[PDB]
């Protein structure tokens, strides 16, 4: 998993996007919770998750 | 009591060990390759020195004896 390209979001129905968004939100939310208690360089994947959430919201 | 304490003590040992195993971070596919490369090159250079030296020694061994 990781970044979500905006090119692959314009063909999906709103529902599909909201679903992706949900996963991203959880992943991002968890990323934080997990990071605080753990050495995860993925503490940079939060930027990618936040940008993906923004992209999905924009497309919807 | 003496029959399930005998199981419980190693049972608690296994609980502690499995907790440690779960919590421990596992080497990724990138740490594994480089660590294997380092161990392999060390093993190769040592075993190679030994193999070369014993290979040059054994004919002299049988000649001497």
């Amino acid at each position: 998993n990781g970044k979500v390209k905006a090119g692959q979001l314009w063909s999906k129905n709103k529902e599909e996007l909201t679903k992706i968004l949900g996963e991203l939100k959880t992943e991002l939310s968890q990323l934080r919770i997990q990071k605080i208690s753990s050495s995860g360089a993925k503490l940079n994947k939060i930027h990618d998750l936040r940008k993906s959430i923004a992209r999905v919201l924009t497309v919807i | 009591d003496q029959i399930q304490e005998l199981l419980d003590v190693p049972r608690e040992f296994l609980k502690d060990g499995i907790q440690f195993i779960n919590r421990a971070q596992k080497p990724d596919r990138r740490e594994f390759i480089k660590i294997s490369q380092a161990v392999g090159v060390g093993f190769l250079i040592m075993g190679a020195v030994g193999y070369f030296v014993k290979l040059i020694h054994v004919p002299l061994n049988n000649i001497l004896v």
Binding site: I33, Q34, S37 | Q19
Partner: protein, 52 residues
Amino acid sequence: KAQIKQALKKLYDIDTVKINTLIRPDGTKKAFARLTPDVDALDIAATKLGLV
């Protein structure tokens, strides 16, 4: 407190008996959520919260 309780229930399937809240000097809110007696906070933290 109601939103915190509902969010905990939805996000971790956690049921609480009460929730106390304060606002720290840094400006963020801290919530002490006491779980129900039948659920163990140690297992909840280990399995869902990554705390040990």
